[PDB]
Ligand binder design. Structure first.
Ligand code: ATP
Ligand code: ATP
Ligand code: ADP
Lengths: 529, 107
C-alpha cells in the first residue's frame, strides 16, 4: 500500500496503480518464479498530455522507487545538428554506461533509465504535414537499433514524453518496443485541493499564513487551472503580500509588533487570482471588453428573440446524449452588429473554456499557417468537458473577392471537415459562426453543414430610432421633438454602427446646426432595399 | 476463381445514412483483414500525403489472402466544389489506377 500521496505527487493517485498493474508486475515478485518462467520485462513506456500537467515528476518517482541509478535527462530539440551523421553520435552516446555494465557485471547489473522529452521532435511523420521537416529520417532508425537488434540489452528502461500523440512513428509502438500508453489529463476539484494543500505546507508550519484564508473557497473558485498555475498563483500572492506590507510599513511607522508579522491575508490571494494569472485553458475575461465596447441596449423585439434562441441552444447542448455536437450560424446585412451578440451569448454560458478565433491575430499569414492555427485551437478545445469556440468572420478567412471569384480551397476543406468531427466519447462542444453574405456561402455548399440559422435585422421604423436615441441620451427635448417631426416619413434603413458614427460626426459642431447636419446626413444615406 | 477483383458503389441523397451501411456490410464479411480510409484523419494534408497514405494502405492490404477496404466520402477526398470547378488531379488519377489493379496470383 503506497504512501506517495503527500510527498511529491499530490493529485495523480490512480495512474500509479494503473501503470504498476500494466508494466511492473514482473519486478515485484520473488525472482525465483520469474526466472523459472523465463519471461522478459517491458522495455519502456510512453506518456502524453497537456503542457504542464506534471509528467516529469512521474518519471522521477518511478525511477526512484525501482532502486535505480541517476536518471540521464535529455531534451528533444537539443539532439539535432546540421552536420552529416552527427545526431547519430549523440544518440549512441547515451547508452555507454549500460553497455559497460552489461559487459562487466554480466546479467546482474542494476537498472538505468533514459528520459527523452518531446520525442516527437525527431520523427519523419511531421514531414507528412505541409512543410519540409524530413529531419533525416535515418535518425529514428538508429534509436530502434539500440532498443533491439543483433546485440541484446537487458538492463535498460526507456520512458518517453510527448505532447502531440498523433505525430509518433507507427514503427515505434510494436511489441518488443515501447508498448504501453497512458494519458495524463487535467485535475479535478479534489486534485486542485490536494495540490494547493501540498504547495502550502511551508507557511502553515511557521504560522506565517493568516488564519483568515480558507482552502475550499480557492479550490472551488479555480475551475480549469493546471499544475504550474497553482504554484504561480502562490508565488504571485507571496510577492504582492510582501510588497503591500513593505509599502504600508514605509507609509506608516507602525509599532514593531505588526512589523515582525508578515501575514499574507486573503485580499492578496483574490487580487492575484483576478489580476495576474491568465489560464491558457480557461476563460479570458479581458478579451470580452475588447469586443463589447458599448454594452447592449434593447431597441426592439428581435434582440430578445435571438438571446432566447441562443439560451435554448445552450441548454440543449449542455445536458443531452445522442448528440454531442451542435452548430449554429448568424446572418444579416453589413454593420448589423453581429459579433457583439455572439460574444454575449457565448459569455452567458458560464462554460469553463471559451475561445475566439478571428483574423485579428492573423495578418500576413499564409493559408497553411491558417489551417495549422485552426487545428491547434480545435485540438486544444477538445481537451475540456465543455467548450465554446467562436469563429469571427467566415468570409474573411476564405479570402473571398467577387471579382474572379478567388479563394483558398485548403482552408475551406479543413473547416468543412472540422465542422463534422465529434469529440472523443463523453465530451461536448459548441460552434458559432458569423458571416455577412449568405448567398455565396450557400452557393459554396457549406450551409448544409450547419444545423440552424438566425437572422439579425436592422432598424426600420422611426420610433425605433427615437427609442435608440433616448437610450443613448445625446439629444435634448426640443431636439428630439424636431427629429421626430422630421422623421415621421418612416423611410429609415440604417445599421447601429453607422448610426453611432453619424451621431459622433454630427456632434462635432456648435449646438445650433447639429440637428440640420444630422438630418441632412441621415437623408443622404437613403437606402431602399 | 476468374474474378479476383470486385467493386461496388453506394450513392444517395445527403443525410441518408450511407457510411453506417458500408461499415455494417464490411463487418458482416468475417474476413481476417479489414481497413477504413476516412478523410477526417488527414486534416490539412497535401495531395502528396494523401496519395502516399492510399498507396501504403493498399500495399498493406496486398499481403493477405482476403481483405476488405472501405473508402468513405469519395467526393470529399478530391476536394470538389461546384464553383470553378476545382479538384486535385493527382488523387483522381491514383484512385483510377488503383481501382483496376489485380493483386498477385492467388489473392
Ligand atoms: N444591441 C446592440 N446590437 C449591436 N451592436 C450593439 C448593440 N449595443 C451596442 N452595440 C455596439 O455596436 C457595435 C457592434 O460592432 P460589431 O463588431 O458587432 O459589428 P458588425 O456589424 O458585426 O461588424 P463586422 O461585420 O464588420 O465584423 C459595438 O460598438 C457594440 O458596442
Ligand atoms: N437503418 C439505418 N440506416 C441508416 N442510418 C441508420 C440506421 N439505423 C441507425 N442509423 C444511424 O444513422 C446514422 C448514419 O450516419 P452516417 O454517417 O452513415 O450518415 P450519412 O448521411 O451517410 O453521412 P455523410 O454526411 O458522411 O454522408 C448513424 O447515427 C446510425 O446510427
Ligand atoms: N500533480 C502535481 N502535484 C504537485 N505539483 C505539480 C503536479 N503537476 C505539476 N506540478 C508542478 O509542475 C512543475 C513541474 O512541471 P512539469 O510537469 O515538469 O512541466 P513539463 O511537463 O512541461 O516539463 C513542478 O514545479 C510541480 O510543482
Amino acid at each position: 500500500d503506497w504512501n506517495f500521496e503527500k510527498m511529491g505527487i499530490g493529485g495523480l493517485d490512480k495512474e500509479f496503480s494503473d501503470i504498476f498493474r500494466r508494466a511492473f508486475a514482473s519486478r515485484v515478485f520473488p525472482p525465483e518464479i520469474v526466472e523459472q518462467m523465463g519471461c522478459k520485462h517491458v522495455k519502456g513506456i510512453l506518456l502524453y498530455g497537456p503542457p504542464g500537467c506534471g509528467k516529469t515528476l512521474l518519471a522521477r518517482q518511478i525511477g526512484k522507487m525501482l532502486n535505480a541509478r541517476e536518471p540521464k535527462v535529455v531534451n528533444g530539440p537539443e539532439i539535432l545538428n546540421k552536420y552529416v551523421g552527427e545526431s547519430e553520435a549523440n544518440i549512441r552516446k547515451l547508452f555507454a554506461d549500460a553497455e559497460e555494465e552489461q559487459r562487466r557485471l554480466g546479467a546482474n547489473s542494476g537498472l538505468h533509465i533514459i528520459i527523452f522529452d518531446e520525442i516527437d521532435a525527431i520523427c519523419k511523420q511531421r514531414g507528412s504535414m505541409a512543410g519540409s521537416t524530413g529531419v533525416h529520417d535515418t535518425v529514428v532508425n538508429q534509436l530502434l537499433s539500440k532498443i533491439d537488434g543483433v546485440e541484446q540489452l537487458n538492463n535498460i528502461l526507456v520512458i518517453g514524453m510527448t505532447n502531440r500523440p498523433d505525430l509518433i512513428d507507427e514503427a515505434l509502438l510494436r511489441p518488443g518496443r515501447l508498448e504501453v500508453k497512458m494519458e495524463i489529463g487535467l485535475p479535478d476539484e479534489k486534485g486542485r485541493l490536494q495540490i494547493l494543500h501540498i504547495h502550502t505546507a511551508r507557511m502553515r508550519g511557521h504560522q506565517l499564513l493568516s488564519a483568515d484564508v480558507d482552502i475550499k473557497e480557492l479550490a472551488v473558485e479555480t475551475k480549469n487551472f493546471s499544475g504550474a498555475e497553482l504554484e504561480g498563483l502562490v508565488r504571485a500572492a507571496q510577492s504582492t503580500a510582501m510588497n503591500r506590507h513593505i509599502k504600508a510599513s514605509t507609509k506608516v511607522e507602525v509599532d514593531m509588533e505588526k512589523a515582525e508579522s508578515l501575514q499574507v491575508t486573503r485580499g492578496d490571494f483574490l487580487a492575484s487570482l483576478e489580476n495576474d494569472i491568465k489560464p491558457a485553458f480557461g476563460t479570458n475575461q479581458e478579451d470580452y471588453a475588447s469586443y463589447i465596447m458599448n454594452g447592449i441596449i434593447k431597441w426592439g423585439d428581435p434582440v430578445t428573440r435571438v438571446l432566447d434562441d441562443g439560451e435554448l441552444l445552450v441548454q440543449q447542448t449542455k445536458n443531452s446524449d445522442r448528440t454531442p455536437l451542435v452548430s449554429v450560424l448568424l446572418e444579416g446585412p453589413p454593420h448589423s452588429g453581429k459579433t457583439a451578440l455572439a460574444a454575449k451569448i457565448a459569455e452567458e454560458s458560464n462554460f469553463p473554456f471559451i475561445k475566439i478565433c478571428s483574423p485579428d491575430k492573423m495578418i500576413g499569414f499564409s493559408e497553411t499557417a491558417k489551417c495549422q492555427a485552426m487545428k491547434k485551437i480545435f485540438d486544444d478545445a477538445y481537451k475540456s468537458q465543455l467548450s465554446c469556440v467562436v469563429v469571427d468572420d467566415i468570409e474573411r478567412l476564405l479570402d473571398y473577392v467577387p471579382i474572379g471569384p478567388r479563394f483558398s480551397n485548403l482552408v475551406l476543406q479543413a473547416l468543412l471537415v472540422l465542422l463534422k468531427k465529434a469529440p472523443p466519447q463523453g465530451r461536448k462542444l459548441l460552434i458559432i459562426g458569423t458571416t455577412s453574405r449568405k448567398d455565396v456561402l450557400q452557393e459554396m455548399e457549406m450551409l448544409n453543414a450547419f444545423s440552424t440559422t438566425i437572422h439579425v435585422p436592422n432598424i426600420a421604423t422611426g420610433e425605433q430610432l427615437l427609442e435608440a436615441l433616448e437610450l443613448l441620451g445625446n439629444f435634448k427635448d426640443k431636439e428630439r421633438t424636431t427629429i421626430a417631426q422630421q422623421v415621421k416619413g418612416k423611410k429609415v434603413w440604417i445599421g447601429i454602427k453607422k448610426l453611432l458614427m453619424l451621431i459622433e460626426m454630427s456632434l462635432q459642431m456648435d449646438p445650433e446646426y447639429r440637428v440640420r447636419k444630422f438630418l441632412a446626413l441621415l437623408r443622404e444615406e437613403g437606402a431602399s432595399p
